[PDB]
Swiss-Prot record, chain A:
Component of the 26S proteasome, a multiprotein complex involved in the ATP-dependent degradation of ubiquitinated proteins. This complex plays a key role in the maintenance of protein homeostasis by removing misfolded or damaged proteins, which could impair cellular functions, and by removing proteins whose functions are no longer required. Therefore, the proteasome participates in numerous cellular processes, including cell cycle progression, apoptosis, or DNA damage repair. The chain holds residues 308 to 357 of 406 of the full protein. It is found in: Cytoplasm; Nucleus. This is 26S proteasome regulatory subunit 8. Belongs to the AAA ATPase family. Component of the 19S proteasome regulatory particle complex. The 26S proteasome consists of a 20S core particle (CP) and two 19S regulatory subunits (RP). The regulatory particle is made of a lid composed of 9 subunits, a base containing 6 ATPases including PSMC5 and few additional components. Component of a complex with USP49 and RUVBL1. Interacts with PRPF19. Interacts with TRIM5. Interacts with NDC80. Interacts with PAAF1. Interacts, in vitro, with the thyroid hormone receptor (in a thyroid hormone T3-dependent manner) and with retinoid X receptor (RXR). Interacts with ERCC6. It comes from Homo sapiens.
Curated annotation (Swiss-Prot), chain B:
Component of the 19S proteasome regulatory particle complex. The 26S proteasome consists of a 20S core particle (CP) and two 19S regulatory subunits (RP). The regulatory particle is made of a lid composed of 9 subunits including PSMD6, a base containing 6 ATPases and few additional components. Residues 1-166 form the PCI domain. Belongs to the proteasome subunit S10 family. This is 26S proteasome non-ATPase regulatory subunit 6. Component of the 26S proteasome, a multiprotein complex involved in the ATP-dependent degradation of ubiquitinated proteins. This complex plays a key role in the maintenance of protein homeostasis by removing misfolded or damaged proteins, which could impair cellular functions, and by removing proteins whose functions are no longer required. Therefore, the proteasome participates in numerous cellular processes, including cell cycle progression, apoptosis, or DNA damage repair.
Amino acid sequence: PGRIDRKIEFPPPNEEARLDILKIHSRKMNLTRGINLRKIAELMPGASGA
Amino acid sequence: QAAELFLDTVSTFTSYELMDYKTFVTYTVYVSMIALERPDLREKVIKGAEILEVLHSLPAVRQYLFSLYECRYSVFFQSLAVVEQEMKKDWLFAPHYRYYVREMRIHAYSQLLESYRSLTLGYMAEAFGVGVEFIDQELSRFIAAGRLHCKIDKVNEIVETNRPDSKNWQYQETIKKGDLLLNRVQKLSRVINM
């Protein structure tokens, strides 16, 4: 315990934390108006960010 | 260039500044109807479902587009006076509302008039738009304005057209830009070196 200063856990994303990765990652694509990423974020049951 | 930046109308969004998507649709059709010719109009705006379903809620704009495409010339001046009137009372188009319809009139006159050669002047009042003296002074100031390629006869009551080449008209703007840039580099040429 005198060695490591702080240990930080990384959880898998929830339905909130998948939507923003869809937001940032969906930036460089030529989309179509009206997408509803909330539904797709629910369709993915939280694997990881990759 | 304005319709060319207004090309997509698909990736365009329910905006903060055009909160009506359909106002953006009216803008892109009002600029498209000058900005592009028939081939483009006869494929792009006439077959777009994404552009069709939004003027599907428009009674006048769907009419105002189809009065021009479907050769409904007489009501086209009525709806033209409507859209020109609102355009006169519109921000950002009130700088050029007179510029708009002076191109719309000569555009429709080019459309009907570049079909036949021996069509008479009295034919157009009942099928095109009323006022024989109006068509008289109106085409007279456009041939006199050096566009609208035809040559009207008067005291036998017939309108004759021709076809010019792409030579002297294309020559004209070249001598315009040549004299303009000659003025530019002449003026700057006196600016530098005292």
